[PDB]
Amino acid sequence: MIKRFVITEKALRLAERENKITIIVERTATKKQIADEVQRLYNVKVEKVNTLITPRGEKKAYVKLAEGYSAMDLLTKLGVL
Amino acid sequence: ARNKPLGKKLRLAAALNSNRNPPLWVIAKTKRRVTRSPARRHWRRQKLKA
Amino acid sequence: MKGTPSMGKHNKGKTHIRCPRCGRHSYNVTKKYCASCGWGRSKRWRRYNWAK
Amino acid sequence: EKKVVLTREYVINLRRTREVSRTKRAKYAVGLIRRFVARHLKVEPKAVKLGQALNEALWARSIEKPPRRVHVVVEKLDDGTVRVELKQ
Amino acid sequence: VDVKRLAAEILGVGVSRVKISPEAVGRLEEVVTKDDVRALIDEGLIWAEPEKGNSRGRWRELHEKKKKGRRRGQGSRKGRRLDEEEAWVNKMRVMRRFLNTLKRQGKLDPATWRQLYRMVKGNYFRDLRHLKTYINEHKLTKEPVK
RNA sequence: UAGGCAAAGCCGCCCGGUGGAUGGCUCGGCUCGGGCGCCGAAGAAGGGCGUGGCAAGCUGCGAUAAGCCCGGGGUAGCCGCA
RNA sequence: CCGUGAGGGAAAGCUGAAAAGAACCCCGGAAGGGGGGUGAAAAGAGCCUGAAACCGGGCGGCUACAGUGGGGCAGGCCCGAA
RNA sequence: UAGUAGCAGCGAAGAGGGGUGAGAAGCCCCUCCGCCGGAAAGGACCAGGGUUUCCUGGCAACUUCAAUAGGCCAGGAGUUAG
RNA sequence: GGACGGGGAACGAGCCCCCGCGCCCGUACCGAGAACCGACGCAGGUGCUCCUGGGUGAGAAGCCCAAGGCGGCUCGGGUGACCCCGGGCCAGGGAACUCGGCAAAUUGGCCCCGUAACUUCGGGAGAAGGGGUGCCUGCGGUCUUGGGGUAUACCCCCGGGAC
Ligand SMILES: [Mg+2]
Ligand SMILES: [Mg+2]
Ligand SMILES: [Mg+2]
Ligand SMILES: [Mg+2]
Ligand SMILES: [Mg+2]
Ligand SMILES: [Mg+2]
Ligand SMILES: [Mg+2]
Ligand SMILES: [Mg+2]
Ligand SMILES: [Mg+2]
Ligand SMILES: [Mg+2]
Ligand SMILES: [Mg+2]
Ligand SMILES: [Mg+2]
Ligand SMILES: [Mg+2]
Ligand SMILES: [Mg+2]
Ligand SMILES: [Mg+2]
Ligand SMILES: [Mg+2]
Ligand SMILES: [Mg+2]
Ligand SMILES: [Mg+2]
Ligand SMILES: [Mg+2]
Ligand SMILES: [Mg+2]
Ligand SMILES: [Mg+2]
Ligand SMILES: [Mg+2]
Ligand SMILES: [Mg+2]
Ligand SMILES: [Mg+2]
Ligand SMILES: [Mg+2]
Ligand SMILES: [Mg+2]
Ligand SMILES: [Zn+2]
């Protein structure tokens, strides 16, 4: 489901300040599916998912982790940071 | 438009992705034969009938 | 008024949109069929012998 | 830091501004002062620099009514540029 | 970046009132974020000129003159100022509440109240002083009304 | 008188600039002859969108996306146009 | 690419055998120029040959008191190697 | 034709000093001068357009002049809802 | 939403406290004298579609100035011939101009006075015609709006507003 992570300047500021990881998923993936995929794949807890479809045709999801998990820690653990 | 249908928006995404000249290595790879793309357009000159 | 001034009224309306079946800009949103392939008024593809 | 080598007081006459178009009179008078100082100080017109108080005096009554004459102080710097300021 | 665009939104003023000190020309090209514009505003190199309010001294002086009766002659009038319809509403309300109070207290009988109430509606009385003068003169009530 | 002796301008040749004719070339067309001849609800043809490390178009392919598996041919290179 | 649409619809081929695709030096803000190189040949990527129209320069003849183009004869100046 | 027409008309317009830069009337800053202010001009926003938005850098082409400017070119980023 | 009826259970609220869930698509920017349409970075059209402070003013008129924006209706400088486009003034005469008072000019707001033939009795009518109009110093009135006086109107006092 997940295609990649967004490590732009905006996405990195979000990870340190709002505990949000930004991902690119399939265009048909819903908020229920994105929260299930993030929890299953990484073993964390998701508070809410904000999703948008980019002007280039992709779906971007701002996944806010619950307040026991570090958004930057998961980025640095995956090695995508 | 401010309010879009997703089908119309996706076709604009396809046009946005393709609007770009060939990369500089392609020009060197083809010995300056491939220099222009037919999917290149300007928003003010050529209008999509999306 | 029929020339340049009336051309300014063609900025916000539409008669046709993109057809799902043929992909052309020929789907009549009021008549509800395609003026190119006939989708929506004919299940067989519209094509005439007088047209090359 | 630049040093002064020559100071003069001049009374520039701007009566010629009443013979050009009314919509360019204040800007025209800037050209008169530059050409006046270039002639009398023996420099080029681009070497002349106008003080702020002189510019406000020229534009005090908007673009159409510059003053008929100006009393100015001309100063020539050590490097060759000339400074013109309104006498005050 | 455009510093005046950022600085105007920090200061909460228009871009036409934002002033950048010419001494800070070197530091303009380095500013990247709004935090960098916040540093310069604290240092005083970026401020906002106070806005102009139209002065009202001439108006306030002129308004006292107009209250005394100056500058309202025939040559200063171009349209309708006094409201003819609105004047009638106040004319009936002044005269009706005066007459109704008098009858309510008892100094005017309902019979004599009726003729005056209809005379008020019929435009007989020019103003309240005329109505008081008529009531005092003709002795329509036992005690004179002030 | 005529020449040294010339303005602007005119004609011819040569060189240069512009231009893309000509000539040569040809993995393209055209015509003719022979063959072969149906595909689709087991979801077709057609279209949209997507897919390459750097890739915009064409070509191929379809989230397993210039590709995956098996066998036969082919042995030393290969990663389309490029 | 054109038309709301039914529909309509171009222009556009060539380095060299091999990139050996121009090292290095001076100048220029840069495109780039000069010198110097590669190549049988610049054929220099704006790339085979490269015409005419056209424009610039050199050369030859004329040129400010003489009305223009074509032909014949006569003369001046210039070319007249094959 | 020709370095000619046009780049006036429709009630706004520039100037001084400094900075950047190879290069500055035109780019950035300040000061002065002006135009709109129930709006060819301020605030909001529909359709339509579709990345023109933002940042960085740039100036071969585009902008009726210039340019170091840019809705242009190159690279990267950006649209979060009970 | 309410009422009016029928049926059912032994539980139980429209009140208070507490717990859980709310998917999908749009969301940048222009919105136009350069982001739309008109081949254009086009004086047209679409959309001035909705909204906006002070002074003068009858006024959402015009003029000046705020808030806010702009000098980008994207050439600059000099000269100050004729001629052209747009604008100002012109003695004496006053339509003699010309197809023709075309064009220009005159009048112009408000208040007071006044107003004909004719008429479908409504009108004509702003008919026509005449007069006034600035600024300054005072004196008044009609109201209105609060507060204080015994005090709901009136009357007295104080502050503000309009004519
Ligand atoms: Mg257009
Ligand atoms: Mg219709
Ligand atoms: Mg007055
Ligand atoms: Mg009435
Ligand atoms: Mg000559
Ligand atoms: Mg297919
Ligand atoms: Mg050639
Ligand atoms: Mg010979
Ligand atoms: Mg001209
Ligand atoms: Mg001019
Ligand atoms: Mg004006
Ligand atoms: Mg103004
Ligand atoms: Mg107005
Ligand atoms: Mg507006
Ligand atoms: Mg930029
Ligand atoms: Mg921009
Ligand atoms: Mg672009
Ligand atoms: Mg959403
Ligand atoms: Mg927005
Ligand atoms: Mg324009
Ligand atoms: Mg302002
Ligand atoms: Mg200008
Ligand atoms: Mg006269
Ligand atoms: Mg006559
Ligand atoms: Mg006559
Ligand atoms: Mg007339
Ligand atoms: Zn169709």
- Rounded-to-integer distance, Cα E9 and Cα E6, Å: 6
Q: Do A53 and B9 touch (CB under 8 A)?
A: yes
Contact E131, E95 (CB under 8 A): yes
Q: What experiment produced this structure?
A: cryo-EM
Per DSSP, the residues of E124-142 read: --SSHHHHHHHHHHTT-SS
Q: What is the number of other CB atoms lying within 10 angstroms of the CB of residue E120? A: 18
Could you tell me which chain B residue has the CA closest to the CA of C23?
B50
Q: What is the number of other CB atoms lying within 10 angstroms of the CB of residue E129? A: 9
- Rounded-to-integer distance, Cα B26 and Cα B34, Å: 7
> How far is residue E102 from each of residues E94, E109, E128, measured CA to CA in Å?
13, 9, 13
Asked if B50 has any chain A CB less than 8 Å from its own CB, the reply is no
Contact D32, D14 (CB under 8 A): yes
What 3-state class would DSSP assign to E10? helix
At CB < 8 A and 24+ separation, what contacts does A46-52 make? none
- Find the discontinuities in chain E where C to next N exceeds 2.5 angstroms and give the residue preceding each: none
- Rounded-to-integer distance, Cα B46 and Cα B39, Å: 11
- Min Cα distance C18 → chain B (Å) is 7
Å from CA of D45 to ligand 14 middle: 45
- Min Cα distance B33 → chain A (Å) is 29
Asked if A56 has any chain B CB less than 8 Å from its own CB, the reply is yes
Residues 36-95 of E with CB under 7 A from strand I: 51-54, 56, 59, 62-63, 65-71, 73-82, 87, 90-91, 93-94
The tokens of A5 are what?
Answer: 């992570």
Q: What is the phi-psi region of residue C44: left when phi exceeds 0, alpha when psi lies from -120 to 50, beta otherwise?
A: beta
Asked if B49 has any chain C CB less than 8 Å from its own CB, the reply is yes
- Rounded-to-integer distance, Cα E99 and Cα E116, Å: 8
Chain B, 5-34: which have a CB under 8 Å from a chain A CB?
6, 9-10, 12-14, 16-17
Could you tell me which chain B residue has the CA closest to the CA of C16?
B49
- Number of H helices and number of E strands within chain B? 2, 0
- Tokens 């990649």 — which residue? A4
Residue D24, C-beta contacts closer than 8 angstroms, at least 6 positions apart: D63
- Tokens 């732009």 — which residue? A8
Ligand that lies nearest to the alpha carbon of residue A49, given by its number in the listed order: 18
The tokens of E93 are what?
Answer: 């309300």
Nucleotide nearest to A34 (CA to C1'): I23
Per DSSP, the residues of E62-127 read: HHHHHHHT-S-SGGG--S--S-HHHHHHHHHHHHHHHHHHHHHHTSS-HHHHHHHHHHHHTT--SS
Element (H, E) at B9: helix B6-18
- Rounded to a whole number of angstroms, the distance between the first and last alpha carbons of chain A is 20
Subunit partners of chain D (3 or more CB pairs within 8 A): none
- Rounded-to-integer distance, Cα A26 and Cα D77, Å: 72
- Rounded-to-integer distance, Cα C16 and Cα C27, Å: 5
Per DSSP, the residues of D52-79 read: HHHHHHHTTT-TT---SEEEEEEEEETT
Resolution value, angstrom units: 2.5
Per DSSP, the residues of chain A read: -EEEE--SHHHHHHHHHH-EEEEEE-TT--HHHHHHHHHHHH---EEEEEEEE-TTS-EEEEEEEPTTS-HHHHHHHHT--
Select the residue from C12, C16, C18 to test the B interface by mutation, using most B Cβ atoms within 10 A: C18
